[model samples]
Target: MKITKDILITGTGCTTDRAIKWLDDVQAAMDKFHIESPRAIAAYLANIGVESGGLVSLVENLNYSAQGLANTWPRRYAVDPRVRPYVPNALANRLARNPVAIANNVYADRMGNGCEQDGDGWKYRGRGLIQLTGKSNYSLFAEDSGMDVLEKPELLETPAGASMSSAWFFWRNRCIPMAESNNFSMVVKTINGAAPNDANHGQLRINRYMKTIAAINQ
Candidate 1:
């Protein structure tokens, strides 16, 4: 179940050059993380394909509209009593279309990040194949991979860093067993967390998984 450039292209619908460029790094990362089985590889590739937009995007895009922000994070954006100190509609309007501001506001004071003023949210925003977010996750990956991802978060943008960090996340999150058991949804939930609508891309991931499986078998 070795991954080739052709397999990557067919599985992710990426361009030839992108496939070729990422082939070796992807394969090496999978090997290092023990993503050897056909099922695991298919699941991993499918997840990565959808998350990275067919391997074209390595960073999370937070450029959201006001409505999009409210829709995506109802608690954080709305004037709900359940969410104290929530962002009012007016504030959401102000934060709209400002990715850095949106990230700082939404991700602040959580996921081992400091308050909004600390800039940890934008500083440690999602990156890599799995879109690893949060300072804690970056710190953990840095410790495990010896890559100093904490000091240099942009390192995850590199081919080797992206692939390796993704594989590391997949393994660390125990996605292998779920993939082996064919629990595709659980794998998605595990990777995306339990936030509402987090697994909204479940169907897309499964679609990519099926494509990868067919391509691999071919």
Candidate 2:
């Protein structure tokens, strides 16, 4: 895919030339929360860019397509070959699904029918950029941002919310996860795909994109 000026300018991802109209939203999220380091940005957006497809990371696929899927762009949504149960259903059977009928259900809102639903149990619909999963997460972020996460779950589907969510994922949970021994190169692979695989004659594709995100974001 050609790197359009719009995407290049989005500054949402350092490596990809992809752009979002609400670039400032992501920037603000980064600035407000003090998540301003290239390494941090690279690590953070790695999950965001791959998980949510820029802004509207919709769908749940055989792997993560949890919302019964609502297209983010032209008949497009994320997919993973990992065989698993249907999304929100899967979350509920295992993670305790949410009864709330929202537009786009992310993993951060997965609290089932229980008194604990409002508190720590409801944080499973973690979606958008950072794949924010779990009731506890939504509660914390909602408290800080004063956004009714339970009522307006679609925010994860919106551009502004997607960016902020990605920033938050990196700002908070990325360090812990990335520190894991078996982190997926799936992220770097996704970047390689988006950037047209024309990078450095196909060498260091991950580094190329990762570097771009690092320069602009961090």
Among these predictions, the greatest lDDT belongs to 1
lDDT of 1 by residue, 10-84 (tens): 666678989989999899889988998877888888778767878889998898988788777877677663664
Candidate 1 lDDT score relative to the true structure: 0.83
Candidate 1 positional error at 17, Å: 1.4
Candidate 2 residue lDDT tens string, 133-189: 565666667766666776676676676666676566554544424423223353334
Which candidate leads in TM-score?
Answer: 1
Q: Which ten residues in a row have the lowest lDDT in candidate 2?
A: 70-79
> Candidates' TM-scores?
0.83, 0.51
What is the alpha-carbon lDDT of model 2 when measured against the actual structure?
0.46
lDDT of 1 at 113: 93
CA lDDT of each candidate?
0.83, 0.46
Question: How does candidate 2 fare on TM-score?
Answer: 0.51
